Amino acid sequence: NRLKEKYNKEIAPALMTKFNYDSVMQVPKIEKIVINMGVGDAVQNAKAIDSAVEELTFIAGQKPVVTRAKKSIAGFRLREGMPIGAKVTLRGERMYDFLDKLISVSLPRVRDFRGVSKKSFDGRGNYTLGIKEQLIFPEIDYDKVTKVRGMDIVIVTTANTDEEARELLTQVGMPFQK
Amino acid sequence: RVNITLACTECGERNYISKKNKRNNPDRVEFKKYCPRDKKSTLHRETK
Amino acid sequence: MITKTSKNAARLKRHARVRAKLSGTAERPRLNVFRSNKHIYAQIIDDVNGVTLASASTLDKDLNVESTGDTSAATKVGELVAKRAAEKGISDVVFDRGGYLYHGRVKALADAAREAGLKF
Amino acid sequence: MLLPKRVKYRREHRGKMRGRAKGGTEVHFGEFGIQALEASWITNRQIEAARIAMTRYMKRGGKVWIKIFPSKPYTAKPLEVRMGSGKGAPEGWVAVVKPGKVLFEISGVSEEVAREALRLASHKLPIKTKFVKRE
Amino acid sequence: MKAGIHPNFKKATVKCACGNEFETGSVKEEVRVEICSECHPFYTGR
RNA sequence: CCUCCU
RNA sequence: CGGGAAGUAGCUCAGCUUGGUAGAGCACAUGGUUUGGGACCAUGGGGUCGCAGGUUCGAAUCCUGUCUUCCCGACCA
RNA sequence: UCGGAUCGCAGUCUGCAACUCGACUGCGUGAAGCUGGAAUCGCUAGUAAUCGCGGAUCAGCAUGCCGCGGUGAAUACGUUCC
RNA sequence: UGGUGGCGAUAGCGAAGAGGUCACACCCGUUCCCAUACCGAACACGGAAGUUAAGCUCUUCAGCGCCGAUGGUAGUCGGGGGUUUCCCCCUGUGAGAGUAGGACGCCGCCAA
RNA sequence: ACUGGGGCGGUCGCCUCCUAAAAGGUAACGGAGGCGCCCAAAGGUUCCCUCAGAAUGGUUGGAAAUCAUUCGCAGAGUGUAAAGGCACAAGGGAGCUUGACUGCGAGACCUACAAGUCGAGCAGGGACGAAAGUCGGGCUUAGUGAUCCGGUGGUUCCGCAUG
RNA sequence: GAGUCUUGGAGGUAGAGCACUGAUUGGACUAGGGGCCGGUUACCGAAUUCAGUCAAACUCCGAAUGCCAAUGAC
Ligand SMILES: [K+]
Ligand SMILES: [K+]
Ligand SMILES: [Mg+2]
Ligand SMILES: [Mg+2]
Ligand SMILES: [Mg+2]
Ligand SMILES: [Mg+2]
Ligand SMILES: [Mg+2]
Ligand SMILES: [Mg+2]
Ligand SMILES: [Mg+2]
Ligand SMILES: [Mg+2]
Ligand SMILES: [Mg+2]
Ligand SMILES: [Mg+2]
Ligand SMILES: [Mg+2]
Ligand SMILES: [Zn+2]
Ligand SMILES: [Zn+2]
């Protein structure tokens, strides 16, 4: 799609010049996008997962895997092996198709949107942004949603540093806070 | 958790003993085991 | 960042796992496979002495195959190592799949090697 | 009164006290110190008496290190019982002190004051001792 | 993509009422948005 | 049921 | 000295044996009723389970130590 | 589309002056509240209930008070009990 | 160079460089076999536009890790002595720590 | 019955550690703990894999749920006590299974006896695997009780003149 | 069969050490808590770090002896 073509033709040659790499193989790319929904109210409500899956299914376009509890935790009333979340890993076209829709369409629909933060890099050039409403995604219908619930969206990149990752994401339409 | 006998379904010979949990396995357990009489692997079933 | 693991480093762990239960003697040597991106290679080895007895690759000029990568090349290589084995007086071997899944090119080599003579 | 905060086993073998001290045979933190010439258990009660005696004479000036810590528990049976019927209950705490061990060190006073402070402490301890200097 | 388990995913075409047009991949056949990157003010600048 | 002292 | 048993709201007691929920009576508080009390009626709130350590995802509950208070025993000489 | 508290902004008027501490207006905000436990009050007719209107005090400030009309019920067997 | 072995990390970490026609990689695809508790990431099948950036290969280095004497000391078999919770002596033996030092690989086989 | 006199209290079999003096063994009413099971997979096999914890980022979401990256001989796990082991895993995952087989068994360990332990290998008929091969329960070591008597199933055995 | 010499081996004691577990001293250092105003202090402090102690049920190590053997010799 347009963003993959934009990456190869425009962004990657620019980053080569920008950072003055020896090889084109050094140019940072987006590896994968992991979308996570933590669903701790699955402890209480059994159908919370079934719903949360269905939302994430349409948003991403792949069937999510249902994550389970690594430990029992008393504070949360969590037992080991309980379904308490759902992730989906996006690579290739399904990744760029998603990331295009995120930037082009969904992040505009965020209520009172004033850019995504410049702080939210991990220190090694991976970006994570927290969505609050699943209503922003155009596949999600307003009427069908009952329980409102957000998600984490990890953008993993081959950038070693934040400034290299920042550049790549800025070169994509991603609206960083001015 | 209880002692069981597995009788060969062909000849009827009570060939094996074993244990099972009745809570976990309430129905009569079945296994394919060597029957010395029949000189082959036959289905054996928990005795009623 | 994402530090990727070397496919070969992963393979060598898998190969070590094979080689724990499997090794060549002079009487019954080890038909090892190595499968590169471009080529496929077969060595017949005994591990007590540590010596290759026969070999065959897609680098051999005897093969007049177009694609060295594909399964058809593996069948040609599997024949040729089995022929060269029979010259040295080798019938029985153990197949060392080299960490690779017993599938595709590696299986194609193994199946060709059987038909050509070698007993496994 | 020094004792360990917890211990792995409340009842331990008494053990033996052969040999010179493994470590702590030189004044290391302080300028001056008192060295054991004989082996003994030193109880936590004796360590407190010795500490106070030297600290009072220094007028709480300078600095005292207590190089031994009474980690080893010792048991006693109740008065007047017969032998046997299990080991006695934990009674107190001792440090095992072998010849050569520097027990206390002192800094921040004169040698004359150090000598006297440590002399006074020596009379609280169940062993012969020698005054020592760092090098 | 192991078959059966996933949803149907195909050409889409998103359309800003504001006028922008482009074709992503999505589940819906005709996506129609009332806002996008070119219309929204943070992106444009006001 | 009870209803402080002068 | 040896052996038991308790220790939970202000007071008296359940819950412990089966690990996941802190209860009950009186008292306390607010309202009502009465000239005003009492009684009565309605409506609330109150510990974190002696202390410490342990096992457990999780301890009033299971294990240990300690403290306090009781009870029983201490015989043949 | 009940209700109109609370709060933000912008005003109006009186007054020397509306911070503490005025009323009113516009725009925005849009709380509790789904007819109220034990208990308890008024009223026998143009009454009760409900709807507006006026006045004194007063610069300004009334859901209070004192008046005014509009619409306009139900029920009373009876005297045992409070 | 690549494959495949043997040898206690003296082989390892870490750091700084160098290299790629072929070979080894990354790399480019998902029609097919096969594949993912989701994902062609991996595994699998195919490809050669690109690249030595990484792996891989080769130099240099003693910061970490590793190996490591000699001497001395502790201990101790045997034999004696004493002031006997312990200590001393004599013919043997002899650490651990510490250190001098070594070491940034040594030895095969096959193919090109 | 044991018993630093007896009574009273406690204990009695099995497993693990220390005491135990660097083979093995080794006492005390010495010091510490477990056991009288559990699991139809928590067994077999084939294939794949790597853990604790921390830092940093991130909706709800906290000290701590799920996600991502980095560091990470293991600081985890191994049904359960402990010890010895285990990261070519003995730890984790998935597919197919029932070897948690029948007949045995060179030879060993242990040992007063009775018992207890290990075992290559052979045959029968299988499981998994392309094959090599592995499999006679479980990382190992507790989870058990002689004889007599009686019950139940099987049986080319006996059957008090003969059937 | 035994003794001794020679050779090989199993094993974790004495000693020692701190690599693990546990205990523990001083300094640097502060997360955090406590007095004292989101602010400050001679009050305690986890981790980290430097140095230092200790251990029947600690071990990165590790004897002397003893033990099991082999090999001849005396
Ligand atoms: K006695
Ligand atoms: K399995
Ligand atoms: Mg009247
Ligand atoms: Mg007025
Ligand atoms: Mg040495
Ligand atoms: Mg007796
Ligand atoms: Mg007695
Ligand atoms: Mg008794
Ligand atoms: Mg011994
Ligand atoms: Mg022994
Ligand atoms: Mg009898
Ligand atoms: Mg007869
Ligand atoms: Mg020692
Ligand atoms: Zn049968
Ligand atoms: Zn637009």
Q: What are the extents of the domains in chain A?
A: 1-178
Decide the pairing of beta strands E31-33 and E14-16.
Answer: parallel
Helices A12-19 and A162-171 cross at an angle (nearest 10°) of 140
* Strands (DSSP E) found in E1-46: 10-11, 14-16, 21-22, 25-26, 31-33
Q: Say if CB A177 and CB A118 are below 8 A apart.
A: yes
Tell me the pairing of strands E10-11 and D63-66: unpaired
Please name the residue that has the structure tokens 């005292």.
Answer: D64
Contact C32, C18 (CB under 8 A): no
Q: Are C32 and C42 in contact (CB under 8 A)?
A: yes
**Which element (helix H / strand E) includes A159?**
none
* Chain A CB within 8 Å of residue C9 CB: no
CB B15 within 8 A of CB B8: yes
Distance from the CA of E14 to the center of ligand 15, in angstroms?
10
Domain boundary assignment for chain D: 23-135
Rounded CA-CA distance A58/E26 in Å is: 8
Read off the amino acid at residue C48: V
Residue A86, classified by CB atoms within 10 Å of its CB into exposed (0-12), middle (13-18) or buried (19+), is buried
User: Residue B20: which domain range?
Assistant: 1-47
Total structural domains in chain B?
A: 1
Q: What is the DSSP letter of D87?
A: P
Dihedral sign, Cα of residue E19, residue E22, residue E23, residue E24: negative
Q: Are A49 and A66 in contact (CB under 8 A)?
A: yes
Top CATH class of C21-120 equals: alpha beta
CB D11 within 8 A of CB D73: yes
Tokens at A59, concatenated:
């948003």
- Nearest-nucleotide field for D16 (CA, C1'): I85
The residue behind tokens 């790319």 is A29
Breaks (C-N over 2.5 A) in chain D follow: none
Residue A147 C-beta-side C-alpha neighbours within 13 Å = 15
Nearest CA to A171 out of A157, A151, A153, A160 is that of: A157
To test the contact with chain A by mutation, choose from E26, E29, E35 the residue with the greatest count of A C-beta atoms within 10 A, namely: E26
- Is-contact A130 A165, C-beta < 8 A? no
How far apart CA C86 and CA C3 sit, in angstroms, is 46
Q: Which of A64, A45, A69 is nearest to A54 (CA)?
A: A64
Within chain A, where are the H helices?
Answer: 2-6, 12-19, 47-60, 92-101, 107-109, 162-171
CA–CA gap between residue A137 and residue A160 (Å, rounded): 30
Main-chain phi, psi angles of D20, to 5 degrees: -80, 165
C54 contacts C26 by C-beta, under 8 angstroms: no
Tell me, in angstroms, the distance from the centre of ligand 2 to residue B31's CA.
Answer: 17
Give all strands (DSSP E) within chain C, no chain letters. Answer: 30-35, 40-46, 51-57, 94-96
Give chain B's length: 48
Q: Which chains are within 8 Å of E by 3+ CB pairs? A: A
3-state secondary structure of D14: coil
- Written as six digits, the tokens of A89 are 């890993």
